[PDB]
Amino acid sequence: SHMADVVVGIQWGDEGKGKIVDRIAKDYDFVVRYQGGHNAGHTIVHKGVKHSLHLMPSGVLYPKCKNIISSAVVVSVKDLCEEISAFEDLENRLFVSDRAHVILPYHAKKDAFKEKSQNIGTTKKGIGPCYEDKMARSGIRMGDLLDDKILEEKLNAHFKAIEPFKKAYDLGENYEKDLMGYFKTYAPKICPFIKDTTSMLIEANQKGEKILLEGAQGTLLDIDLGTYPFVTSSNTTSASACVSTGLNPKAINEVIGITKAYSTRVGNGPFPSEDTTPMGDHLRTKGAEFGTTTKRPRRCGWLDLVALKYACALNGCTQLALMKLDVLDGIDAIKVCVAYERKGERLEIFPSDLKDCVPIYQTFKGWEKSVGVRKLDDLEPNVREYIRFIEKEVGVKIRLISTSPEREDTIFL
Amino acid sequence: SHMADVVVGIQWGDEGKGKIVDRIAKDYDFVVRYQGGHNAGHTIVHKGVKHSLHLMPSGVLYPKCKNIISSAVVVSVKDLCEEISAFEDLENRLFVSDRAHVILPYHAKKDAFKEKSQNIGTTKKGIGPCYEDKMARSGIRMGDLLDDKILEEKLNAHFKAIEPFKKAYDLGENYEKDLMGYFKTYAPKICPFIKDTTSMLIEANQKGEKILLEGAQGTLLDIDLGTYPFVTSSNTTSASACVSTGLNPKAINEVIGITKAYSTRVGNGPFPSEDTTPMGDHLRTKGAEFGTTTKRPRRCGWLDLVALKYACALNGCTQLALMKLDVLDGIDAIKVCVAYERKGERLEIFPSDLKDCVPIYQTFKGWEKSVGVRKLDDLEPNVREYIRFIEKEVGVKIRLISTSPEREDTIFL
Ligand SMILES: Nc1nc2c(ncn2[C@@H]2O[C@H](COP(=O)(O)OP(=O)(O)O)[C@@H](O)[C@H]2O)c(=O)[nH]1
Ligand SMILES: Nc1nc2c(ncn2[C@@H]2O[C@H](COP(=O)(O)OP(=O)(O)O)[C@@H](O)[C@H]2O)c(=O)[nH]1
Ligand SMILES: O=c1[nH]cnc2c1ncn2[C@@H]1O[C@H](COP(=O)(O)O)[C@@H](O)[C@H]1O
Ligand SMILES: O=c1[nH]cnc2c1ncn2[C@@H]1O[C@H](COP(=O)(O)O)[C@@H](O)[C@H]1O
Ligand SMILES: [Ca+2]
Ligand SMILES: [Ca+2]
């Protein structure tokens, strides 16, 4: 247990990771995004001002933090440049790994094309196809932008390899021209931020500096251990934070699992505790469970402790942050899935195939007014019973409770 | 830091991981292969009998051990069944993850095709292309073989999708019918071994059972942090052992880095300490550096402490095993690369681009007769000083010393 703490979403994303990272970031020297891409959307709100970050790490509102975009991330350079322009004096407080892979316009076109047959429900941003080119070892990395010679060589090889797909993926007649001009525009803007971030973090850890690792997506979206194939293409577990930053597993200190008080997922795939009745629509409305751009409605349902115990085991959570209790204000009865029923069998442990798994619910008396509460003793007795039940059943202590989007509407326990 | 120990190769593979795992496995309840495929070849020798293992974990010679092939591995079913047939009574001591992905004949054909332009020097076994289909979320997994109907639907989608490539990858006209029969032959043989190994290791961790995780390839072949693109398509460091196994970073106890007393790599890519003179041929001859399918001569060179210190930081090694000291018997002067130089500038730290990096060598007086020695006190003084230098420079204690292929020719310190 060295100096590196990890924030991980333990459901299917959108749990409130951005809020928690921004709440705690001021006490860290480094804040690190370690996987995924701009498929992520992490929303921070403070004093009535909202920021929705996609690749920019969530320490950006504290100019003393050094924000790192690490090697297992996939980068859309134009979108990252558009984020950089929203903040002042990022030059010595944002660093992008020279080993991170680059998302090309072909990637999103391929994503949309494959989605016609696979119907996973991806964000159509080309995340998966970028990771495919990484495994092929044909992908372009951010360090390649530092030398026009190699970038040209690599683009030309890309140009020759995508030609049998120009018709299938609707690439266009100006693909080569437009891509070459894309890098002419964006490479000069991003190049000063490209660094060996592996060495930076190896040295920071050896020097005992405080490092916060910001997960994206959620544990149940993990490429290996999630609800495959309804998953993202990166590993999302806490150990993924070591795999590609330079830090080793023995550096990991606290593992903070972020869970909502109910469940959401966006996109297709299994969802044992989903609620498609008007009560599920109530959760969506009161929880504002729509896209970052307010477009993609989420599937909504109840908290699922079978899946939470599984995710907590995969990450080694030492604490939980319980988010959005205020969305449940005014609901008369709150259900929690405590086990699955499968063809007469009661399953206490999350199975590798959720086929025929029906939720078994325990019901809790509802509460009225948790919104904005900042003190434990101000919480209603019924909410405190709900919180106590979760800690006891999952076996991980709840150390943070959020009661609104606002940074300071957070109780520390 | 609980009960899971990790053995990791800290160079470019072939360091002696199979020997070390077999030497220590008897004291463990589980022995787990966690990434790669049958590109691995782990050689164990005991009492003049050799076993060359490819996907079989190296606990197989102790029937009380439970051997696990975990979820991030890629499985060639035919080759695994051929390994199964060489041992007696594997049924309750070998378990294959229902989440592991399956290598199809298409994959090796695509591998050879892409190699014509990329010239990485892969093993041509389809490892990379299998990982690509994983990222695409179109890949077939071991659990799919347990249900005839699901396997049918997935093989159909695969046949459809590979239509455009039948000519380009030299797929036969009999591809569909051959693969159909392949699974009719091999799925019955492998089905009894398919299990939810994620749940097995979650429970093993919770019960405090002793787990040994066996890495494949080596740290400098890591897809993210190795000598890209001259790497394998999986993560190879100790953190990968708790990404996809059902363990988590807090479970990792000892991390044993396996290093040869000199260096090899097979395939193309940078190699700062390579020796292409007749002394390099001598290392190849004396070290039998030709592989399992003895038709792949290795590139050889000297120990590189710059790369070694980098690999130890990425893995968090707590002890080192120094292998093949006996290969250096009779060499008058042993070189160790202690630093790099780049265009006249000295570099202490392993850089992200090895272009123009040349070795700075310190030389050591050689020895004559380390072969087969079993007590530290019986080693020649020059051997002892070489060992002390490595551990002092790298900062990790050398706790195992190997002096021949035989299991028992191993010194414990
Ligand atoms: N009502 C309420 N909203 C919250 C709370 N915490 C976060 N929010 C908001 O809920 C949304 C969280 O979804 P998102 O930002 O996608 O989560 P992330 O991806 O894990 O950072 C955002 O709109 C936050 O502003 C909370 O405790 N109560
Ligand atoms: N001369 C000598 N050979 C060894 C020693 N340890 C292992 N070997 C052999 O060296 C080879 C190691 O390469 P390999 O099996 O591919 O290593 P792995 O992939 O890391 O298990 C094998 O042929 C082993 O039998 C040693 O200490 N001395
Ligand atoms: O922003 C996120 N919030 C919630 N789910 C996401 C997010 N980004 C990707 N996913 C999910 O991850 C899966 C794969 O999408 P991809 O990451 O775009 O490939 C789908 O289920 C997505 O909805
Ligand atoms: O058996 C191994 N020993 C040494 N190198 C290996 C082994 N397996 C794969 N590699 C190396 O890993 C790289 C990629 O090969 P692939 O794993 O077949 O994709 C090449 O440099 C290979 O030589
Ligand atoms: Ca989100
Ligand atoms: Ca080997």
What is the total count of domains within chain B? 2
Annotated binding site of B for IMP: 14-17, 39-42, 123, 137, 217, 232, 296
Among A366, A222, A406, residue whose Cα is nearest residue A283 = A366
CB distance B42 to B248 below 8 Å: no
Whether residues B272 and B409 share a domain: the answer is yes
Whether residues A36 and A137 share a domain: the answer is no
Domain end marker among B158, B193, B228: B193
Neighbours of B351 (CB within 10 A): 16
Beta-sheet pairing, B319-323 with B252-260: parallel
Interatomic CA distance for residues B237 and A243, integer angstroms: 7
Domain extent, residue B117, equals 101-193
Neighbours of B343 (CB within 10 A): 7
B283 lines ligand 2 (CB under 6 A): no
Interatomic CA distance for residues A212 and A25, integer angstroms: 7
Interatomic CA distance for residues A286 and A120, integer angstroms: 27
The token duo for B143 is 């659990």
- Confirm whether B231 is domain-assigned: no
- Confirm whether B10 is domain-assigned: no
Q: Is the dihedral of CA B119, B122, B125, B126 positive or negative?
A: negative
Interatomic CA distance for residues B226 and A246, integer angstroms: 11
CB-facing half-sphere around the CA of A264: CA atoms within 13 A: 28
The torsion angles phi and psi of A42, rounded to 5 degrees, stand at -115, 115
At A394, the amino acid letter reads: V
Label residue A201 exposed, middle or buried (CB < 10 Å: 0-12, 13-18, 19+): buried
- Confirm whether A95 is domain-assigned: no
B114: which chain A residues are within 8 Å (Cβ-Cβ)?
Answer: 136, 138
- Measured in angstroms, the CA of A327 and the nearest CA of chain B are apart by 32
Q: Which residues, listed in sequence order, are joined to residue B345 by a DSSP beta bridge?
A: B342
CA-closest residue to ligand 4 atom 20: B122
Annotated binding site of B for substrate: 292-298
> Contact A239/B237, CB-based, under 8 Å?
no
- Confirm whether B65 is domain-assigned: no
Interatomic CA distance for residues B341 and A253, integer angstroms: 36
E strand or H helix at B149, and its extent? helix B148-161
Q: Residue A348 is part of a domain; what is its CATH number? A: 3.90.170.10
> Contact B143/A246, CB-based, under 8 Å?
no
Cα–Cα separations (whole angstroms), residue B352 to A97, A143, B127, B224, B393: 10, 9, 25, 11, 21
Neighbours of A375 (CB within 10 A): 7
The token duo for A147 is 């030398």
Interatomic CA distance for residues A352 and B153, integer angstroms: 19
Backbone region of residue A122 per phi and psi (left: phi > 0; alpha: psi in -120 to 50; beta: other values): beta
Whether residues A299 and A242 share a domain: the answer is yes
Cα–Cα separations (whole angstroms), residue B36 to A349, B13, B55, B178: 28, 12, 8, 25
Which of A290, A324, A407, when mutated, tests ligand 1's pocket best, judged by the most ligand atoms within 8 Å of its CB? Answer: A324
> Residue A135 CA to chain centroid, in angstroms?
21
- Confirm whether B217 is domain-assigned: no
Whether residues A214 and A184 share a domain: the answer is no
A218 lines ligand 1 (CB under 6 A): no
Interatomic CA distance for residues A9 and A256, integer angstroms: 9
B231: which chain A residues are within 8 Å (Cβ-Cβ)?
Answer: 137
The token duo for B252 is 């990792």
CA-closest residue to ligand 2 atom 23: B43
| DSSP conformational letter for A297 | P
Cα–Cα separations (whole angstroms), residue B343 to A148, B190, B310: 20, 55, 21
- Confirm whether A288 is domain-assigned: yes
- Confirm whether A189 is domain-assigned: yes
DSSP alpha helix (H) spans, B162-267? 175-190, 197-206
B316: which chain A residues are within 8 Å (Cβ-Cβ)?
Answer: 248-251
The token duo for A115 is 């989605």
Interatomic CA distance for residues A242 and A254, integer angstroms: 13
Whether residues A249 and A373 share a domain: the answer is yes
User: For residues B235, B238, B244 and B250, what is the CA-based torsion angle, rounded to 10 degrees?
Assistant: -150
Interatomic CA distance for residues B23 and B10, integer angstroms: 18
Among B204, B251, B197, residue whose Cα is nearest residue B3 = B251
Whether residues A167 and A225 share a domain: the answer is no
User: For residues B380, B383, B388 and B390, what is the CA-based torsion angle, rounded to 10 degrees?
Assistant: 180
Whether residues B147 and B270 share a domain: the answer is no
A378-387 own/partner pairs: CB under 8 Å, 24+ apart: A379/A411, A383/A325, A386/A261, A386/A325, A386/A334, A387/A322, A387/A325
Whether residues B392 and B266 share a domain: the answer is yes
E strand or H helix at A309, and its extent? helix A305-315
Experimental technique for the deposited model: X-ray
For ligand 3, which residues put their CB under 6 angstroms from it? A 13-14, 39-41, 120-123, 125, 127-128, 217, 221, 230, 232-233, 266-267
Q: Residue A118 is part of a domain; what is its CATH number? A: 1.10.300.10
- Confirm whether A96 is domain-assigned: no
The token duo for A48 is 């009535």
